[PDB]
Amino acid sequence: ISFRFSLDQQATKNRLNSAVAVHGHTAEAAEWYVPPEEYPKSGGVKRYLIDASMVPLSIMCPSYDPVEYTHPSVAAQPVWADPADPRKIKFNVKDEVNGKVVDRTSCHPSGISIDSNTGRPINPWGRTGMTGRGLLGKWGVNQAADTVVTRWKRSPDGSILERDGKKVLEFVAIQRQDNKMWAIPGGFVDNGEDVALTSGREFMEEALGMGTSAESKDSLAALFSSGTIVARIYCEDPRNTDNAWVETTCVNFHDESGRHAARLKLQGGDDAEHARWMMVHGGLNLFASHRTLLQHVTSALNAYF
Amino acid sequence: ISFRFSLDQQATKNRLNSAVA
Amino acid sequence: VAAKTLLIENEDGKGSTRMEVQDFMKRFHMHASEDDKTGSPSTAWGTLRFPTKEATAPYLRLSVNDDPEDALLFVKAMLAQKYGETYDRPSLILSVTGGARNFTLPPRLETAIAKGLRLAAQRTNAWVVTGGTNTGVMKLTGQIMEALSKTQSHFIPPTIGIATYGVIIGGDDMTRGEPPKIGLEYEMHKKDPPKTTPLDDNHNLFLLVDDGSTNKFGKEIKFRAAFENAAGQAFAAPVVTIVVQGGPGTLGTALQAVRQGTPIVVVDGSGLAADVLAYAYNFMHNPLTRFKSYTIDDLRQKVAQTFNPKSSQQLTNLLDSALECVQDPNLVVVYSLQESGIDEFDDCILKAIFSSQGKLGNKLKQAMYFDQLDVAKRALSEASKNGQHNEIAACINDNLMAAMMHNKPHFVELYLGFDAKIYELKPSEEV
Amino acid sequence: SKNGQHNEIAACINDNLMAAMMHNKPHFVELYLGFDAKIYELKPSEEV
Numbered sequence: 001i002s003f004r005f006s007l008d009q010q011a012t013k014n015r016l017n018s019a020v021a022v023h024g025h026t027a028e029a030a031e032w033y034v035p036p037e038e039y040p041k042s043g044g045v046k047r048y049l050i051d052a053s054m055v056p057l058s059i060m061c062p063s064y065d066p067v068e069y070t071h072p073s074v075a076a077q078p079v080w081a082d083p084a085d086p087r088k089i090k091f092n093v094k095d096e097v098n099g100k101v102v103d104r105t106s107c108h109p110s111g112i113s114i115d116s117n118t119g120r121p122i123n124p125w126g127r128t129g130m131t132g133r134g135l136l137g138k139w140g141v142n143q144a145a146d147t148v149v150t151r152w153k154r155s156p157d158g159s160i161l162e163r164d165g166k167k168v169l170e171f172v173a174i175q176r177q178d179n180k181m182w183a184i185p186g187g188f189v190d191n192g193e194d195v196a197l198t199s200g201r202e203f204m205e206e207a208l209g210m211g212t213s214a215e216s217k218d219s220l221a222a223l224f225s226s227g228t229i230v231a232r233i234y235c236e237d238p239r240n241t242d243n244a245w246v247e248t249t250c251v252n253f254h255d256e257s258g259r260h261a262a263r264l265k266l267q268g269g270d271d272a273e274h275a276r277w278m279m280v281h282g283g284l285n286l287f288a289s290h291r292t293l294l295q296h297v298t299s300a301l302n303a304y305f
Numbered sequence: 306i307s308f309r310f311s312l313d314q315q316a317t318k319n320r321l322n323s324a325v326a
Numbered sequence: 327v328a329a330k331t332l333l334i335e336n337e338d339g340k341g342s343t344r345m346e347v348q349d350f351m352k353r354f355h356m357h358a359s360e361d362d363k364t365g366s367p368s369t370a371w372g373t374l375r376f377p378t379k380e381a382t383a384p385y386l387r388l389s390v391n392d393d394p395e396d397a398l399l400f401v402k403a404m405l406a407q408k409y410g411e412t413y414d415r416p417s418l419i420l421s422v423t424g425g426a427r428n429f430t431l432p433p434r435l436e437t438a439i440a441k442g443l444r445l446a447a448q449r450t451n452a453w454v455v456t457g458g459t460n461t462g463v464m465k466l467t468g469q470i471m472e473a474l475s476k477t478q479s480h481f482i483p484p485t486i487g488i489a490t491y492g493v494i495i496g497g498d499d500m501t502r503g504e505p506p507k508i509g510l511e512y513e514m515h516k517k518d519p520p521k522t523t524p525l526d527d528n529h530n531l532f533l534l535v536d537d538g539s540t541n542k543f544g545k546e547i548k549f550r551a552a553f554e555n556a557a558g559q560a561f562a563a564p565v566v567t568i569v570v571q572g573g574p575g576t577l578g579t580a581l582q583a584v585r586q587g588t589p590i591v592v593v594d595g596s597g598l599a600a601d602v603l604a605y606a607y608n609f610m611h612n613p614l615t616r617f618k619s620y621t622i623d624d625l626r627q628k629v630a631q632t633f634n635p636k637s638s639q640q641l642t643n644l645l646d647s648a649l650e651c652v653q654d655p656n657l658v659v660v661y662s663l664q665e666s667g668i669d670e671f672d673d674c675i676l677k678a679i680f681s682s683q684g685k686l687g688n689k690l691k692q693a694m695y696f697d698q699l700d701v702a703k704r705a706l707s708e709a710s711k712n713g714q715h716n717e718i719a720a721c722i723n724d725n726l727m728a729a730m731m732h733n734k735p736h737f738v739e740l741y742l743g744f745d746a747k748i749y750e751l752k753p754s755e756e757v
Numbered sequence: 758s759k760n761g762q763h764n765e766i767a768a769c770i771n772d773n774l775m776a777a778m779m780h781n782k783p784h785f786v787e788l789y790l791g792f793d794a795k796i797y798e799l800k801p802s803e804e805v
């Protein structure tokens with residue numbers, strides 16, 4: 001019955017949308033993002049609330065009065081935080097701060113525009129109702145790298161699990177320390193380093209807890225030798241403000257045989273509590289735009305979603 | 306089990322190297 | 327004819343120390359109102375006498391912030407006082423949860439689940455933890471243990487009922503009075519005004535968990551799961567939750583059970599919520615051909631038709647909780663009553679026990695209780711191939727000892743064939 | 758039994774059991790009695 005079903009889906013493979021006849025209107029929603037009112041880890045500080053039909057910069061919106069708030073941790077000036085006065089800094093090109101290269105380029109086609117009064121950058125992806133840097137240490141684009149390590153979801157007999165006529169994937173997910181919601185491992189790019197090292201380093205630190213196995217590590221290197229950058233998109237991250245926003249580069253490490261994935265001893269470390277292998281489907285509730293990232297990896301691998 | 310394995314490999318089929326980490 | 331001092335077991339687990347009842351029971355709190363957090367002393371503990379029942383049942387009204395271990399010592403202190411120091415320790419904790427009112431089922435299916443539960447309970451001397459109220463599957467389980475209680479010579483296995491305080495018609499009666507109440511009449515038929523849910527008369531103990539509210543349910547779910555985990559660690563016994571029918575709180579109960587490491591057995595075809603959980607598990611894990619058409623949309627439709635969440639955010643949270651229950655394939659075992667055989671429910675319970683976290687020898691002892699020679703043989707062969715020789719040799723002697731006590735000759739041949747020296751067997755107590 | 762519809766089965770189980778008694782089918786009486794058919798709710802075809 002399994003072979004008959006498999007051959008049946010192996011033989012089966014002017015666009016018009018007639019959904020207006022059923023409902024009686026169109027979709028009329030681009031799925032515009034508005035962050036929640038209470039800023040995380042700020043001790044109850046709330047933004048200035050705006051509706052989802054007023055966010056774009058093409059639209060006028062004369063009643064826009066955002067609040068300027070910067071977190072005490074960011075304001076104490078660590079090594080990974082940019083200076084409080086954003087003057088003389090050049091955006092949209094690779095800029096050298098203390099001899100270390102920082103990307104600073106956004107994937108938005110229009111680019112980043114510089115405010116004349118204060119020199120702070122303005123977010124091209126819409127309004128978020130809040131100025132200042134907030135919890136983010138760098139002005140403008142915070143480049144994040146996400147590591148999606150995937151394997152085919154297999155039964156004990158060795159057969160790959162199949163749902164809706166497509167093969168089912170499985171990815172490593174970590175439970176975040178701050179808000180206890182599951183997410184893809186990843187993090188902000190450190191000074192003087194690129195996305196490859198950052199992605200790999202965050203995966204060992206968070207999912208595996210390495211640092212803070214020789215040949216098996218070499219096996220992991222074999223796992224890390226075949227990665228494809230699937231997307232570079234803007235995050236719908238709740239910590240985003242008008243002067244600091246997260247943009248992610250997603251790196252997919254797929255294990256076709258499943259040998260390298262089976263040698264991982266999952267144990268939560270750094271800013272992660274627990275890590276586990278989790279099935280990909282459309283009803284997943286993950287942090288920021290990780291559902292979009294999982295959609296891109298299943299779209300690229302022709303997997304179920 | 307052999308046929309299931311054979312069909313499974315018959316259906317499965319920006320280069321970045323992250324081994325430096 | 328009332329106890330003044332009690333034997334409370336020490337935290338070391340080596341002996342029991344004698345201490346005053348008011349001294350031990352001072353650590354339990356009550357809430358006078360919803361606003362209150364620190365609370366006031368409870369003073370509502372004792373025994374209730376029910377009509378047509380010879381034995382009396384102890385009751386304790388405790389708070390949500392109270393330690394479940396303390397409640398476990400309290401239960402140990404009653405049993406140690408009543409049955410002596412060498413009372414029969416539980417090798418299985420059987421939690422029966424589900425529908426309080428919506429439990430409607432055909433008699434044959436009910437008879438089959440009841441028969442399997444009765445056999446499992448009588449063979450393993452299990453402690454069955456259900457709800458404290460006089461409705462549905464809890465009342466049915468109470469009837470099963472009522473029939474069970476007119477046998478097994480002296481010892482009767484406890485039927486602990488943990489219920490939220492505030493819904494009980496005799497709540498005013500247990501509040502009014504002095505702290506000790508030995509013989510108190512419980513009137514289930516009395517017309518009490520702001521409450522309508524009575525206690526089951528066949529339950530042997532009662533824990534009424536209070537957080538300050540009237541006519542609100544589900545406040546005792548987390549404490550019940552924590553209490554089962556505490557009991558499981560203390561007596562080294564696996565805890566198995568069974569889901570028959572059930573509402574939204576049964577889903578939350580299953581979520582608590584899977585978060586605390588307790589395995590669950592969902593009886594498919596026995597109800598709505600069970601069908602939703604079984605459907606979710608079969609979609610995520612089952613490799614059979616008939617489950618390949620399962621989708622998130624049909625699951626969402628099932629959640630909407632079953633729970634009736636009204637809003638999309640409620641539906642998203644219920645769907646997320648249902649998908650969170652069946653994330654770990656080891657912790658959920660689905661028994662299909664309407665498809666599989668009549669006598670395979672104990673095999674499903676045993677599969678949940680073996681998939682849980684526990685020592686191999688205790689699981690083999692548990693397998694020996696259910697009379698499943700093939701499961702033990704397969705487990706022994708798998709254990710033999712995977713090395714781990716020190717733990718097998720460390721537990722083979724007590725497993726052999728348990729086999730001698732419980733009259734299982736096939737099991738003695740099995741255990742003796744796997745390098746168990748006959749002269750290294752050790753007694754449980756110290757001479 | 759799997760497809761629900763409990764009211765119609767309970768409504769017709771009594772006459773089916775009655776027909777089984779008249780036509781001498783003991784295996785069928787065991788079958789019909791096992792599927793929640795109360796023995797004391799059987800009804801005659803005619804009116805007395």
Ligand SMILES: Nc1ncnc2c1ncn2[C@@H]1O[C@H](COP(=O)(O)OP(=O)(O)OC[C@H]2O[C@@H](O)[C@H](O)[C@@H]2O)[C@@H](O)[C@H]1O
Binds near residue numbers: 135202271
């Ligand atoms: N530019 C920065 N902004 C904020 N915090 C930073 C920065 N650089 C370093 N940090 C430090 O890194 C710590 C958290 O480690 P990360 O792994 O970098 O943080 P995490 O939230 O896990 O990564 C960002 C996650 O958000 C998503 O938008 C994105 O996909 C990524 O997964 C923070 O406590 C902070 O001290």
Ligand SMILES: Nc1ncnc2c1ncn2[C@@H]1O[C@H](COP(=O)(O)OP(=O)(O)OC[C@H]2O[C@@H](O)[C@H](O)[C@@H]2O)[C@@H](O)[C@H]1O
Binds near residue numbers: 458489574
């Ligand atoms: N423990 C209870 N006892 C009696 N009635 C209850 C209980 N819990 C809820 N009720 C009320 O009775 C109705 C029937 O409940 P169901 O929807 O059938 O099941 P559910 O609401 O999930 O109750 C499950 C509860 O039972 C216990 O097994 C378990 O502890 C769980 O809390 C519900 O609408 C509810 O208002």
Ligand SMILES: [Mg+2]
Binds near residue numbers: 184186187271
């Ligand atoms: Mg991270």
Ligand SMILES: [Mg+2]
Binds near residue numbers: 188202271
């Ligand atoms: Mg980090």
Ligand SMILES: [Mg+2]
Binds near residue numbers: 187202205206271
């Ligand atoms: Mg990190």
